[PDB]
Amino acid sequence: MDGLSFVDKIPDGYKNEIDQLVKKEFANIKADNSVSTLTNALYTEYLKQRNNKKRRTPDFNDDDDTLFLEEYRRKYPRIDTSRYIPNESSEVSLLGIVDSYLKHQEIVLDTLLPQTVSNQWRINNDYIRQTCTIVEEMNIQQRKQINDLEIYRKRL
């Protein structure tokens, strides 16, 4: 488990080396209704279902069919012209009121970006001290190790 990240100042060759040894040990081991059916089929096939491309074109001196199609264009154009009246009445006040809401929504996210930033650096900060604590202790151990190694020889 133990591998000191901050203390071990470990080349790319060692990653490539260890990857090969890990690789060799891997060589050894080796709820909705009908809605979901049509939605998954639409996405898989990459084709959206065609809508009513009729109101836009039409034609004068048609028949009973275009008499309907004509009368459709009138009522929707009157609804359109009424739908543009209540927008222009308020105008830009309704738009800029929503623009202000979006600024309150945005700043909230970036506050959380900082809260995460601080606690993430704070955890790493605690790790750092641990790394330097033990890395010294390991240094102490190795020095003592080398002392015996030659001490035992010089006695014999």
């Binding site: 939605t39 639409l42 996405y43 898989t44 959206k48 809508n51 491309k53």
Partner: peptide, 18 residues
């Protein structure tokens, strides 16, 4: 009816699939 509603069910479909 046409363009906005179409885009909404495209965007729902191709997102969940992805």
């Amino acid at each position: 009816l046409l363009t906005s509603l179409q885009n909404e069910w495209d965007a729902i479909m191709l997102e969940n699939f992805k």
